[PDB]
Design a protein around this nucleic acid. Structure first.
Lengths: 87, 243, 121
RNA sequence: GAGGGUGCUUGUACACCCAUAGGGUGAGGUUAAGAAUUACACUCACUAAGUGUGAACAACACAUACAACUUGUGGGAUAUACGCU
């Protein structure tokens, strides 16, 4: 059904002339947004060393395994509730 | 006072005024309205303890029953809400070994030895704390080696490298004293909270989060850590078996 | 624009964090020889961040006064300073990380010296 | 490698060194143990740091760049680390 719901681009005469188009402005804007996000993350990384060591390691682990309160709690010693509160 | 080392301590408008035991009468507990009630200076008084889950409720319960003696206390009027600063004289009960409580000892990643017992928890040190002297010693050893290799030779290799060898040697004594003080604090908790049984988890797992971080104090045998809590254990009396 | 958030607030908080680091690390340092030797490392941070804040405040006030004099600005006005004092009072970070009384007093005495009349509002 | 000493004071960096200085110790009180001995965030205190001259742990001379340089005293207040429940 899906493959029979798909037409052929040849049904439109000279489809390569007026269809299947893109604007590089969109690509440049997407890359600019990516750069903005990267700059924000670099700002956060630079702020990280100013925090307490335990809270810095909590975030560092949460950024390389990922908000895994259970596995972090067993790793740390604090419970699920305490570890979530500290995060 | 006379030597003038300290001035005259004065008072302010917000100092808690004192009062003794004779002011308080009928120091009992009330359950219908849930407030330890009494009568201070011809005025009945009921406490709004609020959401007090701390040891204040227990202390009040022993106080009304007479288990705890009360000293000259104070009343404060801080911000409208009347507060009572009670000073209790409590006899230090002889703490003895009671082998029916379990003490939970675990290795960690930035929070070294973690000990849990009932509602109580204590950590023996912290990661950067244990690593500061180690980093300092290693860096100093590096620069001492660099200086010695560029120093005046021909006076003997021992005179050239005795400090180089000693700088690596002292790390071992550092970690030995570290394990010593860590086990000392572990046993201190064990004795302090009347714990009779203490057990150290393997708590090793596989993959997950572990197998990438190497654990502060590593496994439960680094520099005979296990041994240094075994020989110390019966040194105090607590029962550290296995986990 | 005089001053950056990194050179004033971030370094101040870095000194504060280093002080807390040494405070934490002093508990298990050499023991049995008294409290003073344990807090020896803390004693280093006696007036560290106060000195840093004072120096940056002096630099910033000097640049403000220099800019005002170089453009012959005979009246310097602090905009919305009363409202910012009000919000800072009912906060914690703003009071204990943004020295505005020190900045205001340095500006006042360094502008009353140069003839610039300072207004607050 | 932090952190420091001399380079008027402060900040940055800088040359020269010290730096396991978050250490190496000494004394007093106290505690625990049969003893050795351990312990105290109990108290007090000592110990490292440019070049030359100089017998010298005496003294003296010399020793980088930019910016700033109105502080001191006290009170009120908050928070941090530690100790107890």
């Amino acid at each position: 059904k899906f493959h029979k719901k798909v037409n052929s681009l040849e049904d439109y005469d000279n489809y390569q002339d007026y269809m299947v188009g893109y604007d590089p402005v969109n690509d440049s804007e997407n890359l600019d947004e990516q750069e903005s996000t990267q700059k924000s993350f670099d700002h956060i990384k630079s702020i990280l060393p100013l925090l307490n060591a335990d809270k810095r390691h909590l975030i560092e682990l949460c950024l390389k395994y990922g908000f895994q309160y259970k596995a972090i709690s067993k790793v740390m010693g604090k419970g699920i509730h305490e570890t979530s509160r500290e995060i | 006072y006379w030597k003038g080392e300290r001035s005259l301590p004065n008072f302010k408008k917000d100092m808690a005024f004192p009062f003794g035991l004779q002011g308080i009468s009928r120091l009992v507990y009330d359950e219908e309205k849930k407030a330890f009630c009494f009568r201070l200076y011809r005025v009945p008084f009921k406490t709004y303890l609020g959401k007090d889950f701390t040891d204040k409720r227990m202390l009040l319960e022993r106080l009304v029953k007479g288990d705890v003696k009360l000293c000259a206390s104070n009343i404060q009027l801080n911000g409208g809400k009347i507060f009572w600063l009670a000073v209790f004289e409590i006899e230090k009960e002889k703490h003895s070994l009671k082998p029916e409580v379990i003490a939970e000892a675990s290795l960690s990643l930035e929070y070294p030895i973690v000990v849990k017992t009932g509602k109580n928890r204590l950590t023996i040190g912290t990661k950067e704390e244990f690593l500061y002297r180690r980093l300092a010693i290693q860096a100093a050893r590096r620069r001492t080696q660099v200086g010695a290799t560029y120093s005046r030779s021909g006076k003997g290799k021992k005179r050239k490298l005795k400090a180089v060898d000693k700088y690596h040697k002292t790390e071992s004594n550092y970690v030995a004293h570290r394990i010593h003080v860590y086990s000392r604090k572990l046993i201190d908790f064990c004795i302090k909270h009347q714990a009779g049984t203490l057990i150290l988890m393997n708590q090793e797992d596989k993959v997950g989060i572990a197998k990438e971080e190497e654990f502060v104090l590593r496994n439960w045998s680094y520099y005979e850590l296990m041994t240094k809590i075994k020989y110390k254990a019966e040194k105090a009396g607590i029962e550290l078996i296995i986990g």
